[PDB]
Amino acid sequence: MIYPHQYNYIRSVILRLKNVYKTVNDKETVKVIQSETYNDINEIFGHIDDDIEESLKVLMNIRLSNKEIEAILNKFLEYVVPFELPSPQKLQKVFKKVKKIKIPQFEEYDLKVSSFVGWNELASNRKYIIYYDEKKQLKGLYGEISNQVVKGFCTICNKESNVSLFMKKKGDYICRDSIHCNKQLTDINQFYNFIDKL
C-alpha cells in the first residue's frame, strides 16, 4: 500500500524517464535516469514484487511505450489506497456550521490519486476541504473560493496553473479542482504546509 502523493511522484519520475528517452540522445545520461527511476521505485517499495520488477524492466528499456507506461501505472495504482470519504453524519460533525453540506461523488481512481478531498459550493462561492492529519483524525476546512480563475503558482500543489483565490486578510490562489491539485501534488507534507500557512 502506498500514499496517493507517492503514486503521483512515481508517475512523475516515469514521465521524466519517458521524456528522457524522447529528448536525451546519450545512452549514458539515459542510464543515470533509468537507475534514478529504479532507485525511486525501490524507495517507494521496500520489497518489490515480480510485477514491479517487470514494470521496472519495461521502464529500463529505452523503447518505452505510453501503453506500457499506462499498464505500469495501473499496476502501481492497485498498490495505492483511495482517500476515504467521511460518512454524511460524520461530515456533519466535521462541518456543524455548514447546513445541508453536499459532497460531489468522487471517482475511485480520483480518490486513489487524491491525498485530500475538497469541493466548492460555487453558489455560495465557498470551498469545503476534508483531509486526514498525521494523527489521522479527519480535518475539514470551509473557506470562500473566488469564482475567477487565473494561472498562478499554487501553494497546495506547489505548481503553477490556473487557480482560484481562496479566502478563509491574506489571499492565496488555489487550483479550482482539488483532484487536479492532488494530481499536481507530489507530497502530503506540502499540502500540510499549505494548511500550516493558512
* Binding site feature residues for Zn(2+): 154, 157, 175, 181
Q: Is 181 in the site for Zn ion (CB under 5 A)?
A: yes
Q: Is 122 in the site for RNA (CB under 7 A)?
A: yes
Shortest distance in whole angstroms from residue 147 CB to RNA: 5
Q: Is 149 in the site for RNA (CB under 7 A)?
A: yes
Q: Which residue do the cell numbers 496517493 mark? A: 4
Are 149 and 142 spatial neighbours (Cβ–Cβ below 8 Å)? no
Q: Please select the residue that binds RNA; options are 12, 92, 158, 162, rule is CB under 7 A.
A: 162
Shortest distance in whole angstroms from residue 1 CB to RNA: 27
The item of RNA, Zn ion, none sharing an interface with residue 44, based on CB under 5 to 8 Å by kind, is none
Q: Please select the residue that binds RNA; options are 102, 139, 189, 198, rule is CB under 7 A.
A: 102
H/E segment holding residue 154: strand 138-154
Q: Please select the residue that binds RNA; options are 32, 147, 153, 171, rule is CB under 7 A.
A: 147
Interacting residues of 184 by C-beta distance below 8 A, sequence separation 6+ = 8, 154, 157, 158, 159, 161, 175
d(CA 117, CA 105): 11
Pull the grid cell for residue 166: 481562496
Angle at 74 between CA 4 and CA 68, to 5 degrees: 130
The item of Zn ion, RNA, none sharing an interface with residue 156, based on CB under 5 to 8 Å by kind, is Zn ion
The item of Zn ion, RNA, none sharing an interface with residue 157, based on CB under 5 to 8 Å by kind, is Zn ion
Nearer to RNA, 15 or 198 (CB): 15
Identify the CA nearest to 128 among candidates 162, 159, 88: 88
d(CA 43, CA 39): 6
Q: What is the contact surface with RNA in residues (CB under 7 A)?
A: 102, 120, 122, 147, 149, 162, 176
